[PDB]
Copies of this chain bind each other. A is one copy, B any other.
Amino acid sequence: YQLQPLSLDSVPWRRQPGQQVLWIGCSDSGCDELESSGLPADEIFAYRSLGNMMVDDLSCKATLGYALDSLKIRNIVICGHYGCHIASGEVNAGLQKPWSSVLDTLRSTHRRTLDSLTGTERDRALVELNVLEQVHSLRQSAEAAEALQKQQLNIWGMVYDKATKRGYQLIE
């Protein structure tokens, strides 16, 4: 995959004004990330969760369903953020399954990549890898797969950098 800086006036999830976007962000990020969204507040329907993840739970299924069925949303953005405390390091005792399982799988699946980086760069790669895995897994849901096959849904990944105050799209 590659990282492309967003231009706020041409974002892939706002090819036209006045539509709502489901924005999946992290609980230890904050409102600064939406300043990099290219979206006005009235176009943001935000689900803010542990590690900007969607897992196999009632909350994630009902939120996606409301967005697709009630709001007729055609764009989802999964926004990770550098410096995340959840998508970081090797372990966190207070983080339950399946959130902890998803991170453990990224750490094992990408052990070669992660081992070639040190500390801070390693956490940054985990944030990017989590965004890519969340986007891929959300496309593989029965409800998203049907919508994608009709060309009525796009799912996008980006990472917000609080140091540059910029978002970066994951192209891959």
Contact = CB atoms under 8 A, between A and B. Distances in A.
Interface of A: 25, 27-28, 30-32, 34, 41, 44-50, 55, 57-63, 65-66, 68-71, 86, 92-96, 98-99
A46 B27 contact: yes
A162 to B, nearest CB: 9
B57 A58 contact: yes
Copies of this chain held together in the complex: 2
Contacts of A27: 45-47, 63
Contact of A62 (B50, B61, B70): B50
Contacts of A28: 45
The winner among A31, A34, A62, A93 for most chain B CB atoms within 10 A is A62
A142 B59 CA distance: 20
Given A27-B63, A57-B59, A66-B94, 5 more contacts: A25-B48, A50-B59, A50-B62, A58-B59, A68-B94
A71 B108 CA distance: 26
Given A50-B63, A94-B70, A99-B62, A44 B30 contact: yes
Contacts of A99: 62
Nearest to A56: B58
A135 to B, nearest CB: 19
A96 B61 contact: yes
Nearest to A71: B94
A122 B66 CA distance: 23
Instruction: Name the 7 nearest CB pairs between A and B, nearest first.
Output: A70-B94, A69-B94, A59-B59, A31-B31, A48-B48, A57-B58, A62-B96
